[PDB]
Structures are given as structure tokens and as C-alpha cells.
Amino acid sequence: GFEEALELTIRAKEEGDPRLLERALEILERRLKEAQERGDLHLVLTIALLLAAIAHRLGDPRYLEVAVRVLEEAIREALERGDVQLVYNLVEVLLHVARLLGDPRVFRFMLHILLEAYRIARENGDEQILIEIVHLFTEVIRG
Amino acid sequence: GFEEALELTIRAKEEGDPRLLERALEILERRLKEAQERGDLHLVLTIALLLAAIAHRLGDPRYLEVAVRVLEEAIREALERGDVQLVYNLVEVLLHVARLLGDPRVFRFMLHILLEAYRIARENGDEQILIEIVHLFTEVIRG
Amino acid sequence: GFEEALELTIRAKEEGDPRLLERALEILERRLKEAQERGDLHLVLTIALLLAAIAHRLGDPRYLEVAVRVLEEAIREALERGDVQLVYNLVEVLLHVARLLGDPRVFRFMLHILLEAYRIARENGDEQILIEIVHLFTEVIRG
């Protein structure tokens, strides 16, 4: 499912044809909506990661903003689920995306989510993810 | 605890109040001494990492220094115990602190520790820790 | 002697003697020829990583090149073997040396290898590696 986007990315770099980046971003945007529906938040994680990395190469912040918005909604759902691990892995991707975009308010969103996920993990009693959340927190406050 | 620090960090981004960073640094410096005293080297790892990130923001090298001296003593104890994984994770944090602080001697300390941890890991199982030690070595020598 | 290279590397830092870097590079190049062809792609990964690190310190691109060419042939062999976890760990080290060397061509190599490994992993049905490959792919296209 990711193969066509990975090939198109290599093909756009070597041939210098940004229309191939745009084609792959279209494929990845279709897939990301299909996984946003259905509730496949683990796949949304990786599609949004790949979507944002290609969008960054193309120089078009629009697709970076779509990845942010979809990752933020997947985080809110995964936090309502009380999954915490999915929230952690979702925030990890959003951190890489926010680092690319440079939007300060995405980091603010992640600080609140991590604090809430720490509270769910504290009352659940999962110690290892409690530390993993604090570590991810120290990375967000950097920038 | 961690929750009060994470709340104060968020509260001091929202409210324009760096005193809340200072209050968090004070709590974490208390907890870090309490953890070093108890020998709680796994918590020493996470407190120092959070302390240094909150100290990097606000920009006070003092709390970076406390973090270096405590991590170093936690590393020496973990190396006495022969716990190659723990000293690996402890040096990993000290490398991030020392990169923030910029003191050459903190790197030199890490060079000698990793060589010793390589000897213990060589005579033990030649596991992934063996490559993880030499991998961490190459990162300490670089910058 | 792995330990000898670690010792010489520390020894060249505080004595400021780059002849010890060149001596460790000699020991590591002898060791890589022993390890390669015989196989042991895991040890090829370790010493090539150490070799290129102290070569970067020495300022000599030549040894960065042999670390690259040995890593690339290890990746091709591990890719022939079908060991997709091994090519992942090999490409991870090849990204660090490619960052040091600064040659655009090694990044092109890594993009093609990762696309292949995804295909082998997709037909093998490993799932977790497929995601880990895509995640590493987003790191390679950055730089």
C-alpha cells in the first residue's frame, strides 16, 4: 500500500519531477482518509508520517497541515479510547511533523495531550509508559 | 513528582511566568537528590532528563550542572553494579545534558565509562548492548 | 582489537596524537576484512560504525568511503539472505555515515534498498518491519 508512494518519492528525486510527489501525496491523502474512517489509527499514524515527509520535500505546507489535523483528531480519539500507547505513538509522529512545519501551537497541543496521557497511565498503573511519556515530553518542550 | 512539573511547564507557557519553570526545577532538584540518595538510578535518569530540558528553557546552567554531577554518580554506581544496560541509558541522558552544557570534561568522562562498559559487555553476552555501546561511543566523540 | 581501537581513540584525544587514530583505523580495517566474506554482518556493522567515526575525527574521507562500501555490500548480502531486520540495522548505520560523508549518492542507495526491503517484507508478511522501514524512509529523505 505504501509501495507506490515510496517509489514515486524516489522517482521524483532522481527525475526531478515534482508532479510525482504530488501524485504520491494524492494517493497518501486518499489512504489517510480511508484509515481515518474505519478508525485504523495505527495506519493513520504511518500514512500521516509519510504524507508529511513527502509534503516537506515538495515544499507545500498544505499537506503538512492536513497531516497535523488528521494526527490531532486521531490523538483525541485514541485518548478518548484510553489507549495511551496509541496516543504515545501518535504524538511521536506529530512531533516529527511539528518539527518540520515549525508551528508553535502544534507543540502546545502535544504538551496537553502528554500531560493527560500521563494521568491516564498513572491511574491505570503502567509505569514504563509513564516514563516514556515524560521523555517524549522533554522532547516537545525543546522545539 | 512528574505531574506537577509537567503542569507547571504548561502553566508557564500559557501564563507568561518563568517563575513556574523555576518552581518545577526546584521540585525536580529535590526529587533528583532523593532518588540519587536512595540509589534509584532509573528515576535519576528521567528526573535529570526532565530537569535539564526545563533548565535549557529559561536558560540556567546551574541545573545542568546538578544534572551532570548526579548522572555521573549514578553512572559510577551502575558501572560498579555491572549493569551495562543501565549505564548505557544513563550515559545517553548525560550526552544530551553535556551537549546542552558544553563542558568538554563531561564528554571525557563518558569516553572512559563506555570503554569500561564495553569490557563488561565483551566478557558477558555479545548482545545488542555491545553494538549499542560502540554506537553510543561514536556519538560522544563527535560533538 | 576492538578494545584497542576504543583505547587508541581515547588515547588520541587527550594526547592529541592523530597517529593513534590512524593506527586504530588500521586495526579496524584488518578486522573488517576478517569479519567480511566470512559473513558476520553484525560485526561488520559495529566496526564500520567505529571506523567512520574516528575517520571523521581524523578528517580523512577515505575511511568514510570504505565504511560505506563495506556497509553497502553487507546490505546487499543481507538483502539476498532475506534478513530484513539486518538490512534495517545496516541502513541505520549507513545513514549516520552518509550524514558524515555528505555524498548524495549514498542517500540514493539507501532509498532504493529500503523500497526493496519493504517489498520483501510485504511478501513475507512481517507487518512490524513494513512500518519500521517506512519510518526509516522518512528519515533518509530528510538527510
**Contact call for residues C83 and C42 (beta carbons, < 8 A):** no
B55 CB-side CA count, 13 A: 25
C-alpha neighbours within 13 Å on the C-beta side of residue B97: 32
Which residues touch B121 (CB under 8 Å, ≥6 apart)? B84, B127, B129, B130, B133
Give B25's contacts (C-beta < 8 A, 6+ positions apart).
B51, B54, B55, B58, B60, B63
Q: What is the DSSP string of B73-108?
A: HHHHHHHHTT-HHHHHHHHHHHHHHHHHH--HHHHH
Q: How far is B35 from chain C (nearest CA, A)?
A: 32
Distance CA B102, CA B106 (A): 8
Hey, of C126, C127, C138, which one would you mutate to test binding to chain A, going by the most A CBs within 10 A of its CB? Answer: C138
- Give the sign of the dihedral formed by CA A117, CA A122, CA A124, CA A129: positive
Closest Cα in chain C to A53: C138
Locate A22 and state its grid cell. 504530488
Contact B109, B74 (CB under 8 A): no
- Cell matching residue A39: 478508525
What does the alpha-carbon distance between residue C50 and residue C35 come to, in Å, rounded to a whole number? 14
Residue bearing cell 518542550: A141
Q: What is the C-alpha separation between B94 and B98, in angstroms, rounded?
A: 6
Angstrom distance (rounded) from CA B89 to CA B106: 16
Q: What are residue B17's phi and psi, to 5 degrees?
A: -135, 90
Report yes or no: A13 and C105 within 8 Å, Cβ to Cβ: no
* Distance in angstroms (rounded) separating the CA atoms of residues C89 and C81: 14
Cα dihedral sign, A110-A111-A117-A121: positive
> Measuring CA to CA, which residue among A23, A26, A28, A1 is closest to residue A11?
A23
Which residues on A lie below 8 Å from B13 (Cβ)? 108, 111
- Measured CA distances, B134 to B85, B142, C16, C26 (Å): 13, 13, 21, 18
Half-sphere exposure of B134 (CA within 13 A, CB side): 29
Give the C-alpha separation, A46 to C118, whole Å.
Answer: 14
Q: Is A125 left (phi over 0), alpha (psi -120 to 50) or beta?
A: left
In chain C, domain spans:
2-140
Q: Do A142 and B53 touch (CB under 8 A)?
A: yes
Question: Distances in Å between the alpha carbon of A141 and those of A74, B17, B113?
Answer: 21, 15, 29
C18 interfaces chain B, CB cutoff of 8 Å: no
The residues near B38 (Cβ < 8 Å, ≥ 6 apart) are none
Interface touch B46/A141, C-beta < 8 Å: no
Residue B45 Cα, gap to closest chain A Cα (Å): 10
Q: Touching check for C96 and chain B: CB below 8 Å?
A: yes
If you write DSSP's letter for every residue of C15-41 in order, what string do you get? TT-HHHHHHHHHHHHHHHHHHSSS--H
Chain A CB within 8 Å of residue C135 CB:
yes
User: Closest Cα of chain A to C48: distance in Å?
Assistant: 26
Chains in touch with A (3+ beta-carbon pairs under 8 Å) read B, C
Q: Which amino acid, B49?
A: L
CA–CA distances in Å: residue B5 to residues A130, A142, C42, C83: 14, 15, 42, 44
Which chain B positions have a beta carbon within 8 Å of C93's beta carbon? 135
Contacts of C71 (CB under 8 A, 6+ apart): C44, C45, C48, C90, C93, C94, C97
The candidate with the shortest Cα–Cα distance to C52, out of C19, C12, C24, is C24
Tell me the nearest-neighbour CA distance from A8 into chain B, angstroms. Answer: 33
Q: What is the CATH number of domain A3-140?
A: 1.25.40
Q: Could you tell me if A75 and A38 are in contact, meaning their C-beta atoms sit under 8 angstroms apart?
A: no
Cell of C15: 594526547
Tell me how many residue pairs between chain B and chain C have CB atoms under 8 A apart: 46
Q: Which letter does DSSP use for residue A126 in this model?
A: -
Residue B45 burial (C-beta neighbours within 10 Å; 0-12, 13-18, 19+): buried
With CB atoms and an 8 Å threshold, state whether B134 touches C13: no
Q: What experiment produced this structure? A: X-ray
CB contact under 8 A, B118 and C56: no
> What's the CA gap between A74 and A93, in Å, rounded?
11
- Residue identified by cell 530537569 is B51
Instruction: Answer whether A63's CB lies under 8 Å from A51's CB.
Output: yes
How far away is chain C from the Cα of A130, in angstroms, using its nearest Cα?
23
Taking the Cβ of residue B85 and every Cβ of chain A, the question of whether any pair is shorter than 8 Å is answered with no
Q: In CATH, which of 2.20.28, 1.25.40, 2.30.110, 2.60.120 is domain C2-140?
A: 1.25.40
Q: Which residues of B touch C13 (CB under 8 A)?
A: 108, 111, 141
Cβ-Cβ pairs closer than 8 A, A with C, add up to 42
Closest CA of chain C from A81, distance in Å: 22
Please indicate whether, in this complex, the C-beta atoms of B115 and C7 are within 8 angstroms of each other.
yes
Whether chain C has a CB inside 8 Å of the CB on A21: the answer is no
Q: Is C45 in a helix, a strand, or coil?
A: helix
Resolution of the coordinates, Å: 3.3
| Distance between CA atoms of residues B86 and B83, nearest Å | 5
What does R_g of chain C's alpha carbons equal in angstroms? 16
Q: Which of A56, A130, A112, B85 is nearest to C143 (CA)?
A: A56
Q: Which fold has domain B2-142?
A: 1.25.40
- What is d(CA C12, CA C24) in angstroms, rounded to the nearest whole number? 10
Where does residue C138 rank: exposed (0-12), middle (13-18), buried (19+ CB within 10 A)?
Answer: buried
Residues of B in contact with C10 (CB under 8 A): 111-112, 115
Half-sphere exposure of B119 (CA within 13 A, CB side): 12
